[model samples]
Target: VDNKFNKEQQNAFYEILHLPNLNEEQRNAFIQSLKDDPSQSANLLAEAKKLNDAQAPK
Candidate 1:
């Protein structure tokens, strides 16, 4: 929640090496904009999954 942008969360995610917050509608567009030409998508997904798993309550 930035002062000016609700989508700032997603933008900050990009800036801080955090995961992109892609909705079903925005997902393909998000992927299209990434620099992931050589399996970066897989790498990002792996990282995202690991991060999400770690956040689960024990």
Candidate 2:
């Protein structure tokens, strides 16, 4: 995977993917958003943290 973001951004991005709850579509779309809005990385990371250890989608 080729990421253009810095270390923090990369970590946040990876953390998001590790969530495993995001469907294929949302995951792909998020990547599109990432390409457009780098700032959203922090937001996604924040969301990821909140969902950490929570049950994934059923």
Candidate 3:
């Protein structure tokens, strides 16, 4: 799999890679909290999709 990511995927990886040094469980809680906040939900979901795409095996 080529490690070539477009702008959105790169941006999403940047976002998740810097997430407060949280572990998987903590990351889930953190993401859930963001989802709970109406203001952050859209951005969170957008970034999450990109992150998932970036991390998925090609």
Candidate 4:
């Protein structure tokens, strides 16, 4: 992912996180979602595991 997401691209990712139809409560939840805390980063490890597993499959 580029460090610089253009307005259109940013809007696209925002939509994936359901920002378009968000109410105040939902928007606030989205606002507080952290992508990179130590615990949450484990989710990224799961994704990496999948990629590595695929490449190494017998």
Q: What is the TM-score of each candidate against the true structure?
A: 0.35, 0.58, 0.43, 0.29
For model 2, give the 10-residue run with minimal summed lDDT. 49-58
On residues 1-58, what C-alpha lDDT tens digit does candidate 1 reach at each position? 3443234334433532543443433444434533333234554445444654565456
Model 1, which residues run further than 4 Å from truth?
Answer: 1-38
Highest TM-score model number:
2
How many clashing residue pairs, candidate 1?
Answer: 0
Once fitted onto the true fold, the runs of candidate 2 whose alpha carbons sit more than 4 angstroms away are: 1-3, 47-55
| Clashing pairs for predicted structure model 3, backbone only | none
**TM-score winner, 3 or 4:** 3
The global C-alpha lDDT for each of the candidates, from Candidate 1 onward, is 0.43, 0.64, 0.52, 0.40
Ranking by TM-score: 2, 3, 1, 4
Measured with C-alpha atoms, the lDDT of residue 28 in candidate 4 is 42
- Lowest-scoring 10 consecutive residues by lDDT in candidate 1? 30-39
Please provide, for model 2 over 1-58, each residue's C-alpha lDDT reduced to its tens digit, 9 standing for 90 to 100: 3556676667767776776666666666555666567778787667655655453654
Candidate 1 lDDT (Cα, 0 to 1): 0.43
What value of lDDT does candidate 4 attain over all alpha carbons? 0.40
Taking the tens digit of each residue's C-alpha lDDT, what string does model 4 give over 12-48? Answer: 3354344333446533433343232333433433433
Which is the better candidate, 1 or 3, if ranked by lDDT? 3
Between 2 and 4, whose lDDT is larger? 2
